[PDB]
Amino acid sequence: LNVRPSAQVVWPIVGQDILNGDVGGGFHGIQITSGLFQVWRGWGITNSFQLYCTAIGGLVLAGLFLFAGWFHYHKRAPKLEWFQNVESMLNHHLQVLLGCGSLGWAG
Amino acid sequence: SHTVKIYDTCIGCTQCVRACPTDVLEMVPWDGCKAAQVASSPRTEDCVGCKRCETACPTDFLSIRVYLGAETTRSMGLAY
Amino acid sequence: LGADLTPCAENPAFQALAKNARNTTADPQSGQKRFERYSQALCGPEGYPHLIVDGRLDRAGDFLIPSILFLYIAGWIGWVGRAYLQAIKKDSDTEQKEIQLDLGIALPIIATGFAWPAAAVKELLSGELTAKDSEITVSPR
Amino acid sequence: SISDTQVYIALVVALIPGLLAWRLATELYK
Amino acid sequence: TLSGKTPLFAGSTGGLLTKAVEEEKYAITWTSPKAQVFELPTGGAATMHEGENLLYIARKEYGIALGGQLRKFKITNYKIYRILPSGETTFIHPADGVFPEKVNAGREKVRFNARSIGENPNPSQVKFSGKATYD
Amino acid sequence: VQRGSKVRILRPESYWFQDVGTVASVDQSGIKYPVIVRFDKVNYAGINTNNFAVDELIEVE
Amino acid sequence: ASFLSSIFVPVIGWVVPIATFSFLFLYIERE
Amino acid sequence: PPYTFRTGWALLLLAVNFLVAAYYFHIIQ
Amino acid sequence: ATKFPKFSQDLAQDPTTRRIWYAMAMGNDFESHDGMTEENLYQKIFATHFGHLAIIFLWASSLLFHVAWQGNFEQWIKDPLHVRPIAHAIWDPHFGKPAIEAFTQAGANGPVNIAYSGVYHWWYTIGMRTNTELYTGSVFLLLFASLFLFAGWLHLQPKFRPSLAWFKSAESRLNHHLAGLFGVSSLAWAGHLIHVAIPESRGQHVGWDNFLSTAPHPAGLQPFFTGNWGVYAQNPDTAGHIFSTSQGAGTAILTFLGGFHPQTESLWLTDMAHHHLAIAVLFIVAGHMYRTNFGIGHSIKEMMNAKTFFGKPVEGPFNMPHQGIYDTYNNSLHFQLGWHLACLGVVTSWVAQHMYSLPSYAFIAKDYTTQAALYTHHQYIAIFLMVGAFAHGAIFLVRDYDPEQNKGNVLERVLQHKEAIISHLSWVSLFLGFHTLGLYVHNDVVVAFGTPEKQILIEPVFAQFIQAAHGKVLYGLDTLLSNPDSVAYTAYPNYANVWLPGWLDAINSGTNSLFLTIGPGDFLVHHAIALGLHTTTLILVKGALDARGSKLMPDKKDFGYAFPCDGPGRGGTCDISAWDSFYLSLFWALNTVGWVTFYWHWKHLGIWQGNVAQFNENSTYLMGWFRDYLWANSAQLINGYNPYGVNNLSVWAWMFLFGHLVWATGFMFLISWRGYWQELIETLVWAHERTPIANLVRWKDKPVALSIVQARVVGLAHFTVGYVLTYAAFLIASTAGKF
Ligand code: CLA
Ligand code: CLA
Ligand code: CLA
Ligand code: CLA
Ligand code: CLA
Ligand SMILES: CC1=C(/C=C/C(C)=C/C=C/C(C)=C/C=C/C=C(C)/C=C/C=C(C)/C=C/C2=C(C)CCCC2(C)C)C(C)(C)CCC1
Ligand SMILES: CC1=C(/C=C/C(C)=C/C=C/C(C)=C/C=C/C=C(C)/C=C/C=C(C)/C=C/C2=C(C)CCCC2(C)C)C(C)(C)CCC1
Ligand SMILES: CC1=C(/C=C/C(C)=C/C=C/C(C)=C\C=C\C=C(C)\C=C\C=C(C)\C=C\C2=C(C)CCCC2(C)C)C(C)(C)CCC1
């Protein structure tokens, strides 16, 4: 209720450190309005270590996504037949992406 | 109607005639260029003034020019 | 010079501002060091340094010295830029060398750009700086 | 202020350039 | 004089307005080898008949546009007619039966200037005269 | 002027007016603009060739 | 004399526009 | 040309410029 | 084939609504009319000019009549510093009782508009003291308008139509206009000031009844003929003088005091009398220069064509070939109109810059809204005249300019290096723009970061030197008139600086707008104004010098002044016509007058509130302008009406929003272009034809979207009207609200 969410600290240069305002919790930074703190509280994250793990996990997933894109273009590119399975895609995207994602998240 | 004048710099490429969306232009015999044909504008009453013919013309400066004049139903491109 | 200008070290408005001087950088004395430096400038009634740009030698630091330093760096950039353009024009694929820099050609030019004033005078007094008006494309009159 | 009479004179006097403005306008149209 | 059956699915709100009745109307005739789908000048997928097709059109540009599309169907026998409210049908494209991009003997130069465009007079020279600078 | 001769343009409405072009060919006939001149830089239409009369050219090379 | 405002302002507002637009309309459509 | 006329007039204007600057710098009063 | 327009068979045969629009746009372009000859062009133009003069005199009559009838002039005379001048009565049926109460002001019985034109001040200064005098002025001006209307009609009649030779008789008109229209008008006014205004200023009633009996001076014209002229400067009005009363009054008719009348804070009438007398003599002399019908006089054609400087051969005047310039000027009305718009535009700015700093009208310096209105008004007019000058200069080049007749002259040479002129204008614009915006943004960021001592504040030392050279001792420079030792100050030989005591008192008092103290805020904004002037010039000059052609369109002269484009070929040619430079320039002209009037207004608001500090400290960063000028001074304006009620600023509050609406409406015509609208109107035409009862009625003129050029005209108009009304509202409401 009292502390103001802030996750961007400015470097002290050409007087721009003024932007690091008193946001509460003995911390100086730009107050964030993206609602990330309310998201992470909803996720049940209670420490900085859990965020570090999640951040690293993300960088590994971003790496995997880069590889996938290189792999699925340069190395193993699906034929037009594959792409035009709209019934299979809808089945997998409704059941796994949305359905199992929502079941997983309910978990 | 608009006025479409052809100039002696024409090389008879036929690109203006092909470009024209209302068949204003046609190729006529000529001795002036190697192609032995020049653009003509017999049907300027049908000219809408789009200047597609000028965009088509490969000569520097242009060998065809459209001078936008008195606007009529045909020149304004009206279906009403 | 004029319009209630005093030395900043005499202006009460300046000293008032200096006592509450904000630290520009991480250095906690950066706020005080700023007003210590600006004390030698002329301050208006509100106690802000006013710069005098009339070529007064006792105010040479205000505009005259910055001017010389800018003209030397800007002239370097322009000369190096001009040099490279003239260098690539003697090659075949000149347009490709504009969007894709020939560092082999560019870096030596950049290095020798320190001596641009000598090169600019030499080229001005050789008729090699400009082209003839008759040999430059123009519009019909 | 000015009298009601003076206002009525001004209006009647203003018919003169009114008439001549009409005559000039018609002549300029030719 | 205009023979040919109206293509199937020729109906749309992009067709003839009151101009077609009051001022002028255009027709485009063509012989198709086979019944095939084509995009109408003003939207809608119409069907050509095998044989003579007649399509009424508001503007000559519709005819020339459709003509261009018929060329992509390997059809070059299309004829555009202007029709007046008195029922005076006039064959207007191709004017002399040969397409204008092809050279045909008998055609005279119209609006030809025996000079480069740079050699036109100044507007000051033809000031208060009837003639223009491109005459 | 002949094939390969560098020429400056004198046509005032030419994009390349007072610019140097290379003569690509000279049509040996009675046509008014026989000399085909190519240019390094393209005009606003993006073409780099144009026909000129011999009187519109000055051989520089 | 103030009463003249009650005559002139409506005339300049309605009578003059109607008369002017009526005439100009009939003039621009005259064949 | 050697540009004697235009340089002469440019110098005269630049002389006036310097004369007004001499008043500005209190060299002439 | 309809009759209208009578002057164009092309437009008359247009079956669309474009016929009506293009007729309006081309009605006054007499050169473009069908079967127009040069003689008929001049004769129609001359007759029309009588029509325009008449309109000006009917407008002038309206101001007098409405103030005489509905104003509070006689009440305002008695207390000019506290009474509000009334413009006219409000008769609006749409007003509620609260609005009627709100506009019942300045001791009026009904709702009235306060006048901000300064006519009361002007009329009071020049000796008018009664509504009867104002009335007599109005009825005279009706008859004077009437005389010009008749002259206009008469000079169209067969026998009285002047010949073309008569219109081309330049030297005779220059003699008559310099000596007569300027010189005698000036002398006649000097007469008015001496015979009427100055007596009235000294409490002496002088009118048509008694002006022949009452001598302007006790001496009574005897010293004038004997040459003892100094008698007319003896016994000036004292510093104690109370205007329109004998208390502290003098007998002098031609003084030379300098500075201001201390009560009225305006120029001495006896100075203004001697000015107009001196000016008159100089103009009468000047209008004896050109030969007419008596052998004596200069031939301007000979002067232009002269090639010999006392034996020594020269290229022409100042060794510059001016041959054919006389004919160029005399034969092209667009050359003249352009040239005369430039001169009038300069003089209009001149007036604006001088009327605020050197007020001539009693007590107008203290009517802050009127001063603000009058400066903004004339600076806006100046800006239009200046854009017109270049517009008609481009029209001359594209329609009238003969290269063969101007062979080798100054005009041909300017066109020969037009690329060099336009490229250097581009540089000055960019150079000013980058660094001025740079310094503002620098200042705006260092102030934002709580370090306003890091601002780049440049003293305008060269302008301050000029103020000091005019004897403003504030800066402590001690040069020319600020140095009592200087030959300038003393006038070493003659010692006839009799202007100087009064002048130095005026310039060294901080209670007037005579050479206002300037600082870093004044430096940055003068450099913004320079940027403005150079960039407007760049657009207009480029427009003028490329009017006949360019690389992109070499034959542009064949297409005329105004045309939409040359189509999307050659990369695209939108806004390529000379007209499209006029269109683009007016945005910059308006932007520039914006900066000029904002600056004028915010500096003066500080001076008027005795808070120059506000401008001096906040004008160096653009948040200061945004907050302390726009935001701060919008407060009262936007509360003109609210849920709680209305006040007298409700009309300005409504006009303020009206301006914002008309401006924004302009963006539609400027952003969305024709093809979108023509396709939309096609569906509306379809819908009308297909609607079962509506299709009963039919248009005579085919509905079409506005033309490409028309859209730029309509767009630019909405934009301009929006610009003017928005600022007029804000300028007046914000000043009248505070004062
Ligand atoms: C394009 C740029 C963009 C950016 C910069 C953002 C930024 C943000 N989004 Mg938004 N969002 C966007 C587009 C964008 N969004 C689009 C196109 C959608 C429609 C799908 C959303 C839907 C959305 C939701 C529902 C939520 C956000 C939230 C947020 C905020 C927190 C980020 C976070 O870590 O929460 C991560 C997000 C969650 C924990 C919620 C995810 C739940 C959704 C329903 C999952 C859907 C995934 C699915 C595969 C995609 C839809 C497919 C379907 C249409 C077939 C942040 C301000 C959150 C917020 O406002 O925090 C306070 C939030 O709850 N966004
Ligand atoms: C070598 C590069 C170079 C040089 C020597 C010049 C020189 C000039 N320019 Mg040009 N200009 C350039 C690049 C250059 N320009 C580029 C890239 C643009 C596109 C933005 C322009 C756009 C431009 C305009 C619109 C105008 C000028 C004008 C001028 C003249 C006046 C000075 C000025 O206004 O600076 C203007 C400077 C800029 C607009 C920014 C320049 C951008 C960078 C810093 C230059 C490029 C450096 C290059 C990348 C270095 C590579 C070198 C390496 C390969 C070795 C002067 C002849 C003016 C003129 O005509 O005066 C008569 C004028 O109005 N210039
Ligand atoms: C420029 C001058 C002008 C004048 C003098 C008026 C006057 C009036 N308008 Mg306004 N009005 C105008 C311009 C003008 N309008 C414009 C440009 C707009 C568009 C922005 C409007 C939009 C507007 C609206 C929306 C309304 C008014 C209304 C009114 C009336 C309100 C007074 C009332 O409450 O009594 C009551 C008065 C009456 C009920 C009417 C009295 C008799 C009428 C005026 C004429 C009788 C017939 C006449 C003899 C002959 C034919 C009419 C005409 C050819 C003269 C008043 C007559 C209100 C009104 O009452 O409308 C009728 C109303 O609702 N006006
Ligand atoms: C000083 C005298 C003066 C004279 C005698 C002329 C004369 C001429 N001008 Mg020039 N001109 C002038 C000053 C002058 N101008 C100025 C100051 C400018 C800068 C704006 C111009 C810019 C200019 C351009 C760009 C053009 C001309 C053109 C012309 C010619 C045709 C005008 C015409 O027919 O338009 C008819 C009249 C109109 C279209 C008037 C409508 C515009 C007004 C201002 C709308 C105002 C909006 C509205 C009424 C306000 C509403 C209020 C709100 C509260 C609701 C004519 C020879 C044209 C030409 O081709 O020259 C040969 C041309 O293209 N003039
Ligand atoms: C805020 C509005 C705005 C601004 C900033 C400009 C700016 C300019 N106009 Mg434009 N103009 C405008 C509105 C504006 N105009 C409008 C409404 C119209 C009516 C259509 C025009 C019509 C117009 C015409 C007809 C002409 C101009 C010209 C100019 C240039 C004048 C040169 C100069 O003095 O400045 C110097 C340059 C600037 C102030 C540009 C901004 C500099 C930026 C901020 C620096 C950016 C660097 C930064 C690191 C980049 C960050 C971005 C990031 C994504 C990398 C200048 C670039 C003229 C011109 O080109 O002359 C050479 C010209 O002839 N304007
Ligand atoms: C946040 C984040 C993250 C993380 C995440 C996570 C961690 C996730 C997970 C997830 C998960 C963890 C999920 C899962 C899920 C699961 C599911 C979905 C399941 C299902 C199941 C079922 C379906 C079942 C069935 C059955 C059987 C088997 C038998 C009996 C019967 C029944 C039917 C019951 C990352 C790092 C990436 C980074 C970024 C952010
Ligand atoms: C300060 C002073 C002084 C001086 C002053 C002076 C010397 C002034 C100047 C001024 C000036 C010097 C001005 C200017 C102006 C200008 C302008 C403003 C211009 C404009 C123009 C135009 C607009 C043009 C047009 C055209 C064109 C564009 C093209 C062709 C045609 C024509 C030509 C028409 C004295 C010593 C007395 C005293 C003290 C103070
Ligand atoms: C002293 C002073 C001042 C004044 C100044 C002035 C007034 C100046 C002038 C100046 C001037 C009046 C100049 C002009 C010039 C001209 C020209 C004509 C130029 C040209 C140039 C060039 C040609 C260059 C080139 C280059 C280079 C060198 C390098 C880079 C590249 C380039 C190529 C760009 C002031 C107050 C501000 C400040 C203080 C001191």
Short mmCIF file of C-alpha atoms and ligand atoms in Angstrom, two decimals, chain C residues 53-56 63-64 67 71 74-80 82 116-117 120-121 124 129-130, chain H residues 17, chain I residues 424 427 462, ligand 8:
data_model
loop_
_atom_site.label_atom_id
_atom_site.label_comp_id
_atom_site.label_asym_id
_atom_site.label_seq_id
_atom_site.Cartn_x
_atom_site.Cartn_y
_atom_site.Cartn_z
CA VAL C 53 30.03 35.69 -27.43
CA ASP C 54 31.34 39.04 -28.89
CA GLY C 55 35.00 37.78 -29.20
CA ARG C 56 36.08 39.36 -25.84
CA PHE C 63 32.13 30.79 -27.31
CA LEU C 64 35.51 31.57 -29.05
CA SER C 67 33.90 27.58 -31.72
CA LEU C 71 35.08 24.02 -36.46
CA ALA C 74 33.30 19.45 -37.89
CA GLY C 75 35.83 20.34 -40.66
CA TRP C 76 37.68 17.02 -40.03
CA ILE C 77 34.36 15.07 -40.43
CA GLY C 78 33.46 17.03 -43.61
CA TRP C 79 36.96 16.68 -45.17
CA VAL C 80 37.22 12.91 -44.35
CA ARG C 82 34.55 14.47 -48.95
CA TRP C 116 42.24 19.08 -43.06
CA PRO C 117 42.89 22.89 -42.81
CA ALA C 120 41.48 22.66 -47.56
CA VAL C 121 43.80 25.71 -48.22
CA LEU C 124 41.25 26.05 -52.48
CA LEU C 129 38.01 22.44 -54.28
CA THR C 130 35.10 23.42 -56.63
CA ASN H 17 31.33 46.72 -39.74
CA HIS I 424 22.56 29.06 -49.10
CA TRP I 427 21.97 26.31 -45.08
CA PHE I 462 24.91 43.51 -30.13
C1 LIG J 8 34.58 36.67 -35.15
C2 LIG J 8 33.44 36.40 -34.21
C3 LIG J 8 32.14 36.45 -34.57
C4 LIG J 8 31.77 36.82 -35.91
C5 LIG J 8 31.94 36.05 -37.01
C6 LIG J 8 31.57 36.31 -38.33
C7 LIG J 8 30.67 37.44 -38.70
C8 LIG J 8 32.04 35.46 -39.35
C9 LIG J 8 31.90 35.57 -40.72
C10 LIG J 8 32.14 34.56 -41.62
C11 LIG J 8 31.84 34.47 -42.99
C12 LIG J 8 31.17 35.61 -43.70
C13 LIG J 8 32.15 33.33 -43.73
C14 LIG J 8 31.77 33.00 -45.01
C15 LIG J 8 32.26 32.03 -45.84
C16 LIG J 8 31.97 31.78 -47.16
C17 LIG J 8 32.22 30.62 -47.90
C18 LIG J 8 32.15 30.69 -49.38
C19 LIG J 8 32.58 29.41 -47.28
C20 LIG J 8 32.84 28.20 -47.86
C21 LIG J 8 33.35 27.09 -47.23
C22 LIG J 8 33.77 25.86 -47.77
C23 LIG J 8 33.84 25.72 -49.26
C24 LIG J 8 34.14 24.80 -46.94
C25 LIG J 8 34.39 23.53 -47.34
C26 LIG J 8 34.65 22.40 -46.50
C27 LIG J 8 35.63 22.42 -45.57
C28 LIG J 8 36.66 23.51 -45.41
C29 LIG J 8 35.78 21.33 -44.55
C30 LIG J 8 34.62 20.35 -44.53
C31 LIG J 8 34.20 19.99 -45.91
C32 LIG J 8 33.76 21.19 -46.75
C33 LIG J 8 33.83 20.77 -48.22
C34 LIG J 8 32.30 21.54 -46.39
C35 LIG J 8 31.01 36.10 -33.61
C36 LIG J 8 30.31 37.38 -33.13
C37 LIG J 8 29.95 35.21 -34.29
C38 LIG J 8 31.55 35.34 -32.40
C39 LIG J 8 32.76 35.96 -31.80
C40 LIG J 8 33.89 36.05 -32.83
#
